[PDB]
């Protein structure tokens, strides 16, 4: 994405009903930090209800704050994760991108708030924080500070203060069809030889030969009198094969 939203206004995107190859991102070696209760190593073989992507930009030193059971201004007032967080956290330097000559002050953070943020909560309130007992009257001043403080992102800032883009992927697993899995690799085809086959999860062993049986467009398998599988239709090419 060209520009991210601020950390106090972290951008959430919903992903569902698609195929995600987590291996590609995992085999990218382009991010500074990549943490996952989920095992990163080849678990694009699992299905989930949804994938929620929370993206923002923070200084490098604050990057550590995005983890379960973490404290800090980002964790307390900008972006809070549940202690039972499921998913991964990814971060990579954006000093080449979010830094700017003269100071990049678009990205802000919430330093002042009445209370800490709940898990997965976003607070964009522009109400002046009332530090003391005097009402703020809609204007910042003594005992009344603007809740949003502006980062100065520059190419010369320290790495800990340098901008880092952070994206958090949360997997949803509820009582639902769970339509995002993301695996499904296939192989070639072999005929006229005793082999072990797996067609769309249907397993078996035998010899696959070309057939002349005329299936219906919506039907995939053929059965005999004894309920044994007899013919199949190749998912990658719509043709009928006899099993012996």
């Amino acid at each position, epitope marked *: 994405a*060209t*520009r991210f*939203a601020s950390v106090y*206004a972290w951008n959430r995107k919903r992903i569902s009903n698609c195929v995600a190859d987590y291996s590609v991102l995992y085999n990218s070696a382009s991010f500074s930090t990549f943490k996952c209760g989920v095992s990163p190593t080849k678990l694009n073989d699992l299905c989930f209800t949804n994938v929620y992507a929370d993206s923002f930009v923070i200084r490098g030193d604050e990057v550590r704050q995005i983890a379960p059971g973490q404290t800090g201004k980002i964790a307390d007032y900008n972006y809070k994760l549940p202690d039972d967080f499921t998913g991964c956290v990814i971060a990579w330097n954006s000093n*080449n*991108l979010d*830094s*700017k*000559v*003269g100071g*990049n*002050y*678009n990205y*802000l953070y919430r330093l002042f708030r009445k209370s800490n943020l709940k898990p997965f909560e976003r607070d964009i309130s*522009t109400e002046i924080y009332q530090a003391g007992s005097t009402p703020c009257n809609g204007v910042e001043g003594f005992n009344c500070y603007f809740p*949003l403080q*502006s980062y100065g992102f520059q190419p010369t800032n320290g790495v800990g203060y340098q901008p880092y883009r952070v994206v958090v992927l949360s997997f949803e697993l509820l009582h639902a069809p769970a339509t995002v899995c993301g695996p499904k690799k296939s192989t070639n085809l072999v005929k006229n030889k005793c082999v072990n086959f797996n067609f769309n999860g249907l397993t078996g062993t035998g010899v696959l030969t070309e057939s002349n049986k005329k299936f219906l467009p919506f039907q995939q398998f053929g059965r005999d009198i004894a309920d044994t599988t007899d013919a199949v239709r190749d998912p990658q090419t719509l043709e009928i094969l006899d099993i012996t």
Partner: antibody
Amino acid sequence: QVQLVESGGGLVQPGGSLRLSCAASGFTFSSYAMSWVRQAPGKGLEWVSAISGSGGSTYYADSVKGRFTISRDNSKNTLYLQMNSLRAEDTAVYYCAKDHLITMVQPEYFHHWGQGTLVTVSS
Amino acid sequence: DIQMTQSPSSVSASVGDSVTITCRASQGISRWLAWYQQRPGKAPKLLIYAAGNLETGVPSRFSGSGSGTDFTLTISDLQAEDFATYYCQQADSFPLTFGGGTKVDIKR
């Protein structure tokens, strides 16, 4: 997608003052940074003034600084630009520009463009 | 400080050709740039923002490239409505500075 309407331009005596107004609708005024940019009749674009989603920070071009003043109000959802010591070089079409992204301190890009009003100074 | 030069000043080309406009900033501006088009009698409209990111309504044949100092706007397919004046501005150093301006005409 939003509506930006500029007004207040006209024909005034040299050394006079004017007050141009930008009416913004369709979006929250406070979260976006406004800009006033003049284009000369026979020249290209050049930025003049900018405000930052509030009024705390005012940015001015090097040829308009010391005479112009930019202010904004969320209550009436509008922008005001007061021009003092108007000269013959101030005759231009003024445009009220806004960027698609929610920018509060800096304008950066200018994706939204108004109709612009012609300000002419002559004797 | 950040005055930028846009070339070529004025060019002429036929329908269906490609037009290249090169804009150079005095200093490296990372990816803080905007390429605009403007026809006579109308307000200018953005073609490219950042460095090569296109506008939603602008046709896909308009492309932006370059980084830091050099930048290039390429029009792969010229049409009768592609003859206008093109500009480049920076969006990283205040005050914000525009380019010289490039006018596209019809080759004959």
